[PDB]
Amino acid sequence: EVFNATRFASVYAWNRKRISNCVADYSVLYNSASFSTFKCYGVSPTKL
């Protein structure tokens, strides 16, 4: 729902989401072949 929703917020008051007591896989977020730009500083996108 954070990615696919009916509408978003503005920049002066944006949505803040915390991921706690959960688990996910960042492998599906990389092979989507639908993103325009993808920058990931601080760590490698394939070794995080």
Binding site: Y30, N31, T37, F38, C40, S44, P45, T46
Partner: protein, 97 residues
């Protein structure tokens, strides 16, 4: 040893780089002078860097106005092996008798 006037330049330092992100680990007694771009999964660039490409050869930034932890340190490693040949300061010793 620490160098305060040998490598400490005002306009930074770009002639010395260190590998940080490349996956190829340098084994001992080896050398690799290849300047490539780190590949992150898809889109292997290795010279046409862009989408999902990082610069592993990060710059140091040697400046004389920095702290003691950022000053350049000229490091020299001396490896060898034994039981093959002597040296000079070993000892002046020719055939005695």
């Amino acid at each position: 040893w620490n160098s305060n006037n040998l490598d400490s330049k005002v306009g930074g330092n770009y002639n010395y780089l260190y590998r940080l992100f490349r996956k190829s680990n340098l084994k001992p007694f080896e050398r690799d002078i290849s300047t490539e771009i780190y590949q992150a999964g898809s889109t292997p660039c290795n010279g046409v860097e862009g989408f999902n490409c990082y610069f592993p050869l990060q710059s140091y930034g040697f400046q004389p106005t920095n702290g003691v932890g950022y000053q350049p340190y000229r490091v020299v490693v001396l490896s060898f092996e034994l039981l093959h040949a002597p040296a000079t300061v070993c000892g002046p010793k020719k055939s005695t008798n």
